[model samples]
Target: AQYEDGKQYTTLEKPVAGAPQVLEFFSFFCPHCYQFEEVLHISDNVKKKLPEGVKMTKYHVNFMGGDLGKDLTQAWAVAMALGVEDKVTVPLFEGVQKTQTIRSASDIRDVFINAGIKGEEYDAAWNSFVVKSLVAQQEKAAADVQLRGVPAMFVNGKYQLNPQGMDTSNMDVFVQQYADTVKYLSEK
Candidate 1:
């Protein structure tokens, strides 16, 4: 099926083989993705127990926004450039999910700050060339992967999984099962 390549999604970089890759396709606004974090952590622990060649990485998708959302996306790009991809996920998710309401750029900045990233570093990184390039890469992935929603998974660029209609509460088990599937595929 032909789809909008620009809005589809994938990880920004390809995973290499010395380690099994768990490329989780997630989004900051996705409640399911928030719930899935625990499962992802479990999967990480499982990878830690694996021999030596296994790793996990996350790809955050940002397509549901209009203008206000774009700024948040840029904040995420800044986080990535500053080399704190893991550090920014939870707080960003929490801020977006908050019912108290925060829509301004400064508000989003506060979320990043709460995530342990300094505001100055964020300022610098947001304007850095490297961060801009990474953001571009993310855009390309979104367009090319033809994704319909967030919280997807792709293993080794061949296998893909999307948890859209499935129950959100069972994501931990489903993610674990998916990881096991990746392990099985790796052995092939």
Candidate 2:
């Protein structure tokens, strides 16, 4: 199957790997990112429907919010490492976009507290080598992309999705279409 360039997805320079993998570049402060996760639940759908052997990775972009952006990225990495991203995703997004509660690392801890993660555990993960390295690597990945906007999906880390041809007005059609596109791309 061939994917039309620009119409479907743009090239990511190199074939990143043998098996198809998804790398999502997104930010916590983005309204579209929030909608993708909460409103449409596309990320959840993609996870549930992805073909066997395909894996997805979400990276927090740090080009916004200055140093706060960096901290949020670290916070995300810590959540990722601790397997608590699912727990904090909506709450963090809601707080960032709605309540406007998170301002500093201390405020981020409040999000975790509400999610049932102990302050001790959060601090430990935040300071740990594993989470720190993941944060660094993810920031590097985001930096590598010529990302115009977030909630961007890159298949196999080489095929960047272009939403121009995608019909987003219909949820059923869009999710099915999007899933199929991802499915086809996953095999390449």
Candidate 3:
């Protein structure tokens, strides 16, 4: 996987253990995160090859977008709770990053609506206890990392992934390579 401590990865001192976990952090307001989502498809690419029992959680960082950050993260949590992240992620990203039409949570709801999630369902999930807890947990996870950048990936909640050392000449190769790196890391 072309890994090395401090170069491509570093072990977490407070390494979390439970099931094998992959934690990805990104923000809707982040341009690089958008490119990774649209251009690299890192989240989608990495999710596909992960092994069984290796749970992956994508956390939306609240360090961006000022007050709107929490709202968007909550929006993401509701989508996760509804199991519609696959349906809504790209659209939300495009709405925020490309169209720049998402200025508030209402705009987020409309994107969810456009993605086919009914307004009632969106509201129900938005106010659900589980979704609230998810939002809180994801926020805590992001704070724990003290993230300085977007599109950060961690394996098993211990080894941080560094794609910088990876081959990036060909993106197709790079995506699969990154996926393979993630796969290898999970199995570690």
Candidate 4:
């Protein structure tokens, strides 16, 4: 998918049928995105209930543009390209959350290695076209969104800040409510 600068919706080339699509703006360093990970997938109690063809894309918001950000961005890109995002997401999150240190790209490489991904495969994926493009997309998205924090969400191209915008206390509740809200807005 060709990334469009300044717009989350455009970054994801595939079109979602519903009017109100969702873009989960996140960062690897974000504690909240990690907390919300388990519930992010469609499940029984907290159904993702996205409208038919309502596409959802995750945009990694790079806050610091440092080694950590670069590594994570590369990882996401690699996973996306290798069709192993589902496999890598949780383990990567766990690594970040559990690891005492995650300041460098090597730290992430080790995490991927520990997760059973071969060093050569990891290297190839990290440097693959998809990974590099996605990493660039992260930077572009952050610049366009003027992002300041991790775990922010954008609904149909608009930012959703909490408290005055949306409550983010409970992941299950929030995720369900968020899907419902998208459906509701699409009807309007």
Candidate 5:
């Protein structure tokens, strides 16, 4: 899957600092993003394949602007802030997509607790100013990119990867191609 300029992915004007950035833009309520979790298992495969000095981050997109979207976005930011994202991401996704059990903030908190987060820790992270600021920053970044949907990847904050025309039914092939594309862009 060769990356086409301005088609498959759009390059950013300036490269992000610290390292090459690989960001996954997603929404917890998005069914496709949930399916993408099955296909990619993003926290495991994508994070594992990232080259040294290439930082991987997940940005929760709230383009829909509803209470659910907003709460999930905050939840994600808080999880990331508490360093519990890798632990809680899959369960959180499943809570929503599999069991259809996640609805209110308490449900989101329960997901974290099930993932081994302590009650005090969860409370601190969830209501902290740091999490709120991070959520705001991510929301603004999503808007700046004119994000239209979830499960989108941006490399170095410049190129946005689109799997629109790809045959992603074969999860293995799709994952390999996706990793290859990210590696190629990181090296560029």
Candidate 6:
């Protein structure tokens, strides 16, 4: 599927190098982002299908700008820092959107503990300088893009795709088109 230049996605003036970076700008507290998890089959279709040297990352948006938003963003940073994002991502989303079991930092920590991460380890990672730095970077990236919504995608820091704005009635095709766009942008 050929992605439209100005409508479906837009290209960035400068692209980041190394491995192609596919960034999902999302917030766990967002209903649309949670819906994206299932509707888009993000893990299977997008993350799993990426070619070698393509890096997929989730940037938790702190657009909500409150304690809860900050806490969830911090939790995501910690999870990513520990290299356990894959293990905790779904559970964290379910905990917040499905079970409504996660409300505070402690609750987020419990999710990690339940995932076999030690209490001290979770705490250390949560407060680590690296996690802090990454969280700050996430914020800056979102701000730089002028991101106005969750469940948005940025490929190689160049092309931006927002599936939420697309026609959901044909989501299967939309998702494939999104993946194709990522692949196309990565190669460029």
Q: What is the lDDT for 13 in model 3? A: 78
Better of 1 and 5 by TM-score: 5
Write the residue-wise lDDT of candidate 2 on 101-149 in tens digits: 8888898889999899998999999999999799888867766665658
Instruction: Quote the positional error of residue 100 for candidate 6 in Å.
Output: 1.2
Error in Å for residue 99 of model 4: 3.4
C-alpha TM-scores of all predictions: 0.73, 0.89, 0.88, 0.71, 0.85, 0.85
- Lowest summed-lDDT stretch of 10 residues in model 5? 11-20
Task: Itemize residue pairs with steric clashes in candidate 2.
Answer: none
Displacement of residue 184 (Cα, Å) in model 4 is 2.5
Candidate with best lDDT: 3
Q: Per-residue lDDT for 122-162 in model 1, tens only?
A: 78887788877877766655555566677666565544543
Clashing pairs in 3: none
What would the TM-score be for candidate 5 when compared with the true structure? 0.85
Q: Write the per-residue lDDT of candidate 3 for residues 1-188, one digit (tens) a residue.
A: 35667665677777765523878898988887887877898877788897555577788878889878888899989988888988988898888878889898899899999989999999999999999899988878876767778778888778887777677789888788778878877777
lDDT of 6 by residue, 72-162 (tens): 8888888888989878988988998899898888888888999999999988888799999988978877877678888788876778775
> Residue 136 in candidate 6 has what lDDT?
91
Give the better candidate number (2 or 3) by lDDT: 3
Q: Clashing residue pairs, candidate 5?
A: 12-158
Best by TM-score: 2
Q: Which stretches of candidate 6 lie over 4 Å from their true place?
A: 12-20, 47-50
Lowest lDDT 10-residue stretch of candidate 3? 11-20
Could you arrange the candidates by TM-score from highest to lowest? 2, 3, 5, 6, 1, 4
User: What 10-residue stretch in candidate 2 is worst by lDDT?
Assistant: 12-21
- Give each model's whole-structure lDDT: 0.60, 0.80, 0.82, 0.60, 0.76, 0.77
